[PDB]
Design a protein around this ligand. Structure first.
Ligand SMILES: Nc1ncnc2c1ncn2[C@@H]1O[C@H](COP(=O)(O)OP(=O)(O)O)[C@@H](O)[C@H]1O
Ligand SMILES: O=c1[nH]c(=O)n([C@H]2C[C@H](O)[C@@H](COP(=O)(O)O)O2)cc1/C=C/Br
Ligand SMILES: O=c1[nH]c(=O)n([C@H]2C[C@H](O)[C@@H](COP(=O)(O)O)O2)cc1/C=C/Br
Lengths: 325, 315
């Protein structure tokens, strides 16, 4: 009864327009209703996650830090708290979906006439568990203490994840927004995502323990560049220093001799395991939503497909519709 | 070959460690027959920079002195409490990978506390006592990973007046009284889950109110019972208005969450061990239980590996 689907997670910085451009893609291809399934960001839960408003809280906390209404040491812990709120929703979902995914190691008895059903999603779990938390650290708004809980506890990623990092020119990104507009965080966020990509590619060939002992620890000088120049350049064959491991080499995770502590190592392993499965793609949103979406279309043929029960797709759809409700 | 995964939990200060060790010294006559994994204090006391333990307690002291808003003190707590998760999880997740899921004296690998202690028992106790905001429950309860078959949860128990001497960190009835209660519920929940679905008498479960919380901090009510009912479980504590909508229905995602939370707890094989006596007895009793526990299968090779890893981090 099988049929191949196309899991596509659309990520990148915020305010860039990856949503009004992800929707304009649904209108001009969903000519046939059952050929595409969209899953939007769960604001409804973020803005009322068991009582607190993750969004307001993550920003308000910074405003509260500047006014000195709270200790900078607490403001960091306080941040970690809110930042973490974004995790659950996206995770409950992703975890369910991985369950409806057919991981059949076998030959095909029959083929399906129809084209592959593409299920588009707004942001991938790593955004909450790795991209943002890491950007907060780099900018100094959050304490590293919360990285293990998010980076090292990642669940096995099922084959076929297509991560599409959206990108916009810098001066244009600063208009799509004007929540708070401060270069430091943005400049970093953009950078991090670029690293993410380099990390995925990197991980495709080499192990995380590559030039680890050749990776200078993460210092304030490094963080400074990340908040100013948007350095980190996306490159053909990435090296350890063009990845996220450049940001993970932290004294707080290593011991006396300067070795990354045992557990934390095992963690790097799973974090690698996850990112490595992914199929990285970059999509420019520097133009009319029409183009952005058209471009995304040209990529469909390059993405890695996965298999799932025809029945399940119909179920998934209902669930997705049951919660985006 | 077949191993015996045994996780030893319960309240703190009770002595489940000096009694879990006295069990290793007596039956490890043959070296390769038993493997112990102790609590990773070394990481808790320096988890990427902060000392989870001091922070969870100090935050309370800081709350009483009014050095910080009670609203922040709650969020601040959630933060630290969460720190306890990673270590235990990195481990457990690795171990699940070395477990053979393929369709004479078995090697028993004893562990100090099971991940649910950090992700469900303690966080929940903090809530009930009012030291933590519910906002952090979904992140810990609903994101639980598939538990592999063969988990033997052994909840240790001590008499009340005796428990208050094993400790005297901070000694305050409210939290203890609750912690004891919660663990009892956990057990009742596991059993309960064996037969019925979480959506049983859900619509007959009164929401969680302050009156309820009050009893949980005073009488150690919650009694362990043969055939548990919805109200003797943890679901009695999970029915929260903050998780339900207007009409009073538990919101979609949170439901799916309950599902996975149930999925986990249900796999477990619950056992109660009394530490109200000489460590010798405590351990001897635990031995009598070995034959009742559910065994799992793993590569002989893996066991040797696991051992090395365990030894590699328990140094
Ligand atoms: N069965 C017992 N009888 C008397 N004292 C005990 C017993 N078990 C433990 N203790 C004492 O109480 C203290 C706390 O117990 P511990 O083993 O550390 O508990 P836990 O496993 O909860 O951390 C120990 O340092 C020990 O001296
Ligand atoms: O981890 C996060 N942290 C965060 O602060 N945010 C923030 C970023 C932004 O203000 C808002 C989400 O809106 P858009 O990203 O669609 O513009 O929440 C988002 C995530 C990620 C969720 Br997965
Ligand atoms: O989640 C937790 N939260 C917590 O505060 N603690 C606390 C409880 C205790 O002070 C200390 C651990 O010592 P024992 O439990 O062995 O006596 O950390 C522990 C856990 C659980 C880890 Br899994």
């Amino acid at each position: 009864v099988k049929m191949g689907v196309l899991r596509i997670y659309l990520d990148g910085a915020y305010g860039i327009g990856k949503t009004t451009a992800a929707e304009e893609f649904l209108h001009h291809f969903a000519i046939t209703p059952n050929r595409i399934l969209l899953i939007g960001e769960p604001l409804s839960y973020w803005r009322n996650l068991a009582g607190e408003d993750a969004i307001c809280g993550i920003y308000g906390t910074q405003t509260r830090r500047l006014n000195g209404d709270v200790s900078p040491e607490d403001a960091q812990r306080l941040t970690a708290h809110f930042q973490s709120l974004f995790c659950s929703p996206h995770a409950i979902m992703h975890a369910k979906i991985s369950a409806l995914m057919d991981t059949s190691t076998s030959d095909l008895v029959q083929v399906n006439k129809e084209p592959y059903k593409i299920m588009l999603s707004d942001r991938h779990p790593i955004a909450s568990t790795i991209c943002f938390p890491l950007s907060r650290y780099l900018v100094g708004d959050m304490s590293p203490a919360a990285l293990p809980g998010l980076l090292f506890t990642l669940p096995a990623e099922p084959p076929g994840t297509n991560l599409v990092v959206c990108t916009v020119s810098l001066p244009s990104h600063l208009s799509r927004v004007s929540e708070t507009v401060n270069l430091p965080f943005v400049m970093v966020l953009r950078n991090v995502y670029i690293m993410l990509i380099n990390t995925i590619i990197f991980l495709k060939t080499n192990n995380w323990h590559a030039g680890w002992n050749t990776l200078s620890f993460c210092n304030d000088v490094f963080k400074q560049k990340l908040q100013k120049s948007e350095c980190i350049k996306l490159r053909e064959v990435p090296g350890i220093e063009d990845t996220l491991f450049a940001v993970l080499k932290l004294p707080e995770l290593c011991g006396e001799f300067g070795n990354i502590l045992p557990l934390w190592a095992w963690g790097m392993e799973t974090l690698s395991n996850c990112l490595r499965s992914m199929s990285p793609f970059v999509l420019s949103l520097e133009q009319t939503p029409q183009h952005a979406a058209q471009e995304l279309k040209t990529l469909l043929p390059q993405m890695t497909p996965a298999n799932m029960s025809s029945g399940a797709w119909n179920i998934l759809k209902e669930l997705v519709n049951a919660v985006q409700d």
